[PDB]
RNA sequence: CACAUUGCGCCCGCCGGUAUUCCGGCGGGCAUGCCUGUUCGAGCGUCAUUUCAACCAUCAAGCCCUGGGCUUGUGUUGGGGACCCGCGGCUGCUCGCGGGCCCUGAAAAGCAGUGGCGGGCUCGCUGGCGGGUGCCAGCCGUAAAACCC
């Protein structure tokens, strides 16, 4: 399913510097001797929020590495108040290479071109049903608690100790 | 036998989910100068 | 508008999501310098609303002060001492 | 030895046999697998069954694909529970759908030539069709000479 | 640093930044000449034009063994293209000045013998044949040395080529390059013993004689009247042996 | 391991390959060329995984076993059909004489006793064609490139050529011969 | 101020000197060591040489038996009837 | 660097003396903390990596009454609806073949049926011969042939 979501973005790729500045040259000597809404992967964080604030986003793709983790913490909870589907994606530096910048916290999806809204529509119930189903699950309960071999003998002895006479 | 079947499935489960891929003292390495 | 929804969560300190931040980040801090640098700043809607911008010139440094007292009061905050 | 069948559902085109039964061999031993089709055209109806051999192994393959995009399809892999299971479910398991050209073979028995005895009765049923065509065409308000 | 960045575009995906970053690299697979001006340096290693002719020997051992060797990666096709090109162009200051003096037959190869401004260059060209290249042997030592006789040889043939007064380079021809003329694809423009041994004389070659040791010394030597058979190559004389102008065939047949 | 896509893939190129032979089987094996025979080379590349019987099998005629490996074919009715069936695994086109010349001179092999030499002595050619009369390495320069009543057993001798694989570098007439030059 | 727009395809369709122009001479250096020339090809290397460098049979088998880089020279003449009949050198890139 | 003694290191270059090596001198450099950038890196910190792409005829060939027209190039997801037909069988009911209308996201829960030819496998008889086979990613249409070799 990130295979499947990055068949559909890299189509939608925003622009690299340098072949902005050959549009804007191409345009510019065609004036010295029109144009279609450009579509486009939505980036950024307070660009995003208020896409999924306004119901603009149709799909949203959070990354799961934030250095501060409050910046996204509501993300997931906003989404879903909001009515859009969301995916959490694994690396921010996957987003961030899918724009042409280093890391992205958020991606968005708002609008496609004609020829492909029905993959869109499609990576939409893929999502909100292959992966939104199964956190539905477990998404309100607590973490953590992987203990192993190690920290099972060290609880044992814990509690070994306090069998006589806690101090 | 069993174990020997389920090991084979979870194997499957997660090249399926997951794919295929995945002296002692330390030393602050000789960088260009 | 990220950073509103940040400025709500760090109102509630004591709630289940910023204490056990804060906890981890506490045993994080000790087990480095006294004085060290941030790369970025760990409450960004804060350092925003104070002036910080994400420019070159611009930088985050964390700093400890140990709390308590000198039955003598030091007149000016322990953020001034930091 | 529990055999545990497997309802696939939602298939692309090009997912039939003998890939269906290659990768989910990787996944455990399969004993039976049957892929719905038609009779008027040898065509599947998207649909599949398989028999592993351990029931242990089907939950594994199916909570693993259970909603899986390929070529866009959304894939619906079950477990069939065991009571549900239907006797008559692999009548045709292993065994290749020998497409058949019906309207192919039975336009061409009417080319063949016949006896003058069968000719004479087809002639037989053909009036009394079309003698009922003009009683009923008769209420109608029309009526053919010849 | 560059090759970093290169790589780094090209994991990101951006393959047109990398392909405008490999266009600075100048990379000798696509460009042909070596990656690294080597001007400088040949100044200091020669600083007299006769020292350049001292030298001359080992270059052109080296570019004429690899005229006629395969490509590998560390001196790729191109780089192989202009080393056959700059033997052809010293060849054809030695038959317009008519330098070459001497030459051998052994077991090896063929040796040749040319005095150029008073200074003897003695040089091995290997049987035109397939060559082996069993054992270990290291192609990035050899494409060090190919890289700094290329830019040798080419400076070298500017200063001969400017001394007699053609101009450089030479031109050339793809088509009758590509139609096999090897020496006779090149033309040479004039302004902005060997001269009598066969100049009355027209030679005929065969398809069993050696077509470019052959050719080569017979021009260096007076003849301007050569044809050969068809399969040899394109830009000779008369291709038919019954031409009754030919005088003398070279055959060695049983 | 093998994804659930491979598997789905495979099947429509096996499917497409089916009808695109069944086609070419049914339609006239004519073409837009003149009856009069030619020489070409022909270079096996990587297109498909999975190869069908009888595209198979004239790769096995023609010895295109490996990727990246090329042979000398003349152009007959038998082998226009037989190039045309086996189209999306192969290279092929009109070599010039530069390019027959340089390809048998930096990779040659001979075919002596089921063993791969390379063509270092005339007196190899001597001992395994020699009644045929060819009798030197430009002898089967001349037989190839002007094909004659001997350029069956000419071709059969020489080892395909095992080209080497280009950095960057249907039928073509003279662009094999950029990828002649690359590849060599 | 700045050159207009060019497409691609035309960039790519769009896209020498005597060094010792001041050349004077140098006393050599006492440190610089050449590197010694080879020695001339002599009468043994040739492919038809003088009928007197030609070794035996008994010294020709010996001599492919015993193990190289241990004789004096890395090849034995040999005669040849044509140059046709003449091996390519099997040490020549070596 | 050193109570700073006209002492002693290290890097690059030069000068004078029997000097490529020796001696002395000279010139330019070598403190710490921090910022921006460059370059070189380290980490059982995290991630990606098994290529779900395009690829029929954007026109060819044969014709006719000489300039327009004709013919061939076989290429369709599945399911459902007391609806209207034609033709084949069925004693008949009905079932197959093709249509006219309507619906559904590339939707889905046994309802497997028409005779074969070759090949694979297996079983018997004397490599050969004869039977079977819920086996063919091989073909055909009720015979058989093609493929194969």
Redesign the pocket.
């Known amino acids: 399913l990130?295979?499947?979501a990055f068949?559909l973005l890299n189509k939608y790729r925003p622009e690299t510097k340098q072949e902005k500045k050959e549009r804007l040259l191409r345009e510019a000597t065609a004036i010295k001797e029109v144009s279609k809404k450009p579509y486009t992967v939505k980036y950024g964080l307070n660009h995003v929020v208020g896409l999924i604030e306004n119901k603009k986003a149709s799909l949203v793709l959070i990354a799961?590495?934030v250095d501060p983790i409050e910046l996204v913490v509501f993300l997931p909870a906003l989404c879903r108040k909001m009515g859009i589907p969301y995916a959490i994606i694994?690396?921010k530096?996957?987003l961030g290479t899918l724009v042409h910048k280093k890391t992205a916290a958020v991606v968005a999806i708002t609008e496609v071109r004609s020829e492909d809204k029905?993959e869109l529509?499609?990576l939409?119930?893929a999502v909100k049903e292959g992966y939104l189903e199964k956190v539905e699950d477990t998404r309100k309960r607590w973490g953590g608690g992987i203990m192993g071999f190690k920290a099972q003998k060290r609880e044992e002895k814990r509690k070994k100790s306090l069998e006589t006479a806690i101090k | 036998s069993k174990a020997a079947k389920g090991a084979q499935a979870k194997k499957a489960a997660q090249?399926?989910l997951?794919?295929?891929?995945?002296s002692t003292t330390?030393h602050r390495?000789?960088?260009?100068v | 508008g990220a950073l509103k929804y940040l400025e709500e969560l760090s109102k509630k300190k004591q709630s289940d999501v910023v204490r056990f931040l804060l906890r981890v980040r506490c045993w994080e801090y000790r087990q480095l310098n006294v004085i060290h640098?941030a790369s970025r700043p760990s409450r960004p809607d804060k350092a925003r609303r104070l002036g910080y911008k994400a420019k070159?010139?611009?930088?985050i440094?964390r700093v400890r002060v140990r709390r308590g007292g000198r039955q003598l009061k030091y007149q000016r905050s322990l953020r001034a001492t930091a | 030895s529990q055999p545990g069948v497997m309802?696939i559902?939602?298939?692309?085109?090009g997912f039939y046999?003998?890939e269906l039964?290659?990768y989910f061999s990787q996944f455990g031993e399969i004993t039976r697998l049957?892929?719905?089709?038609?009779?008027?055209?040898?065509?599947?109806?998207?649909?599949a069954?398989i028999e592993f051999a351990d029931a242990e192994v089907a939950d594994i393959a199916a909570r693993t694909m259970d909603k899986?995009?390929?070529?866009?399809?959304?894939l619906?892999c079950?477990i069939?529970p065991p009571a549900?299971v239907?006797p008559?479910?692999?009548?045709?398991?292993?065994?290749?759908?020998?497409?058949?050209?019906?309207?192919?073979?039975?336009?061409?028995?009417?080319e063949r030539p016949?006896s003058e005895s069968?000719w004479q009765?087809?002639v037989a049923?053909?009036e009394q069709?079309?003698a009922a065509?003009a009683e009923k065409l008769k209420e109608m308000g029309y009526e053919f000479e010849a | 640093?560059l090759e970093?960045?290169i790589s780094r575009a090209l994991?990101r995906g951006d393959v047109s930044n990398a392909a405008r970053l490999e266009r600075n690299a100048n990379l000798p697979e696509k460009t042909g000449k070596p990656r690294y001006t080597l001007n400088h340096i040949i100044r200091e290693r020669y600083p007299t034009f006769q020292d350049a002719l001292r030298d001359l020997d080992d270059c052109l051992s080296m570019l004429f063994l690899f005229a006629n060797l395969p490509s590998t990666t560390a001196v790729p096709a191109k780089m192989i293209a202009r080393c056959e090109r700059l033997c052809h162009e010293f060849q054809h200051y030695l038959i317009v000045t008519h330098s070459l003096r001497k030459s051998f037959l052994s077991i090896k190869g063929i040796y040749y013998q040319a005095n150029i401004q008073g200074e003897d260059i003695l040089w091995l060209v290997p049987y035109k044949f397939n060559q082996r290249i069993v054992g270990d042997v290291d192609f990035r030592i050899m494409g060090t040395f190919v890289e700094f006789y290329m830019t040798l040889l080419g400076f070298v043939n500017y200063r001969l080529y400017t001394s007699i007064g053609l101009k450089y380079p030479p031109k050339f021809d793809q088509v009758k390059d590509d139609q096999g003329a090897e020496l006779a694809a090149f033309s040479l423009e004039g302004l902005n013993d060997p001269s009598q041994l066969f100049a009355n004389f027209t030679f005929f070659l065969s398809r069993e004689t050696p077509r470019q040791p052959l050719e080569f010394i017979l021009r260096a030597f007076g003849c301007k009247r050569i044809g050969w058979d068809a399969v040899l190559g394109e830009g000779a004389f008369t291709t038919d042996e019954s031409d009754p102008r030919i005088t003398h065939q070279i055959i060695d047949r049983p | 391991?093998?994804?659930?896509?491979?598997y789905?893939?495979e099947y429509?190129?096996?499917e497409?390959e089916?009808?695109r032979l069944?086609?070419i089987a049914?339609?006239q094996g004519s073409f837009?060329i003149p009856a009069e025979a030619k020489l070409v080379f022909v270079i096996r590349i990587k297109?498909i995984n999975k190869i069908?019987?009888?595209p198979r099998?004239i790769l096995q005629l023609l010895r295109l076993r490996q990727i990246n490996n090329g042979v000398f074919v003349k152009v007959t009715k038998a082998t226009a059909e037989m190039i045309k069936i086996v189209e999306?695994w192969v290279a092929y086109g009109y070599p010039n004489l530069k390019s027959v010349r340089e390809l048998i001179y930096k990779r040659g092999y001979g075919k002596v006793n089921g063993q791969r030499i390379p063509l270092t002595d005339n007196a190899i050619i001597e001992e395994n064609l020699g009644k045929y009369g060819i009798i030197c390495i430009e002898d089967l320069i001349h037989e190839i490139f002007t094909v004659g009543p001997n350029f069956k057993q000419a071709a059969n001798f020489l080892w395909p050529f095992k080209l080497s694989n280009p950095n960057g570098g249907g039928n073509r007439e003279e662009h094999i011969n950029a990828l002649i030059r690359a590849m060599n | 101020r700045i050159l207009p727009y060019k497409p691609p395809e035309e960039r790519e369709r769009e896209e020498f000197y005597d060094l010792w122009q001041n050349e004077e001479p140098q006393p050599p250096n006492?440190?610089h060591i050449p590197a010694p020339k080879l020695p001339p090809p002599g009468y043994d290397l040739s492919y038809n040489p003088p009928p007197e460098y030609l070794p035996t049979k008994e010294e020709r088998e010996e001599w492919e038996k015993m193990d190289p880089e241990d004789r004096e020279k890395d090849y034995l003449p040999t005669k040849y009837d044509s140059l046709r009949k003449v091996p390519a050198w099997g040490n020549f890139v070596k």
Do not use: C
């Open positions: 990130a295979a499947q068949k799961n590495d694994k690396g530096a996957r029905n529509a499609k939409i119930s | 090249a399926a997951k794919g295929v891929h995945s330390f390495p000789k960088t260009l | 640098r070159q010139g611009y930088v440094y | 309802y559902a939602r298939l692309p085109h046999e003998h039964r290659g049957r892929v719905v089709r038609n009779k008027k055209t040898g065509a599947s109806r998207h649909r069954f899986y995009l390929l070529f866009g399809h959304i619906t079950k069939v549900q239907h008559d479910l692999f009548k045709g398991a292993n065994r290749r759908f020998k497409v058949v050209p019906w309207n192919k073979m039975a336009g061409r028995q009417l016949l069968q009765v087809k049923k053909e069709r079309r065509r | 640093a970093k960045k994991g | 391991f093998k994804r659930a896509e491979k789905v893939k429509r190129e096996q497409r089916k009808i069944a086609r049914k339609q837009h297109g069908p019987p009888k099998k999306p | 006492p440190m």
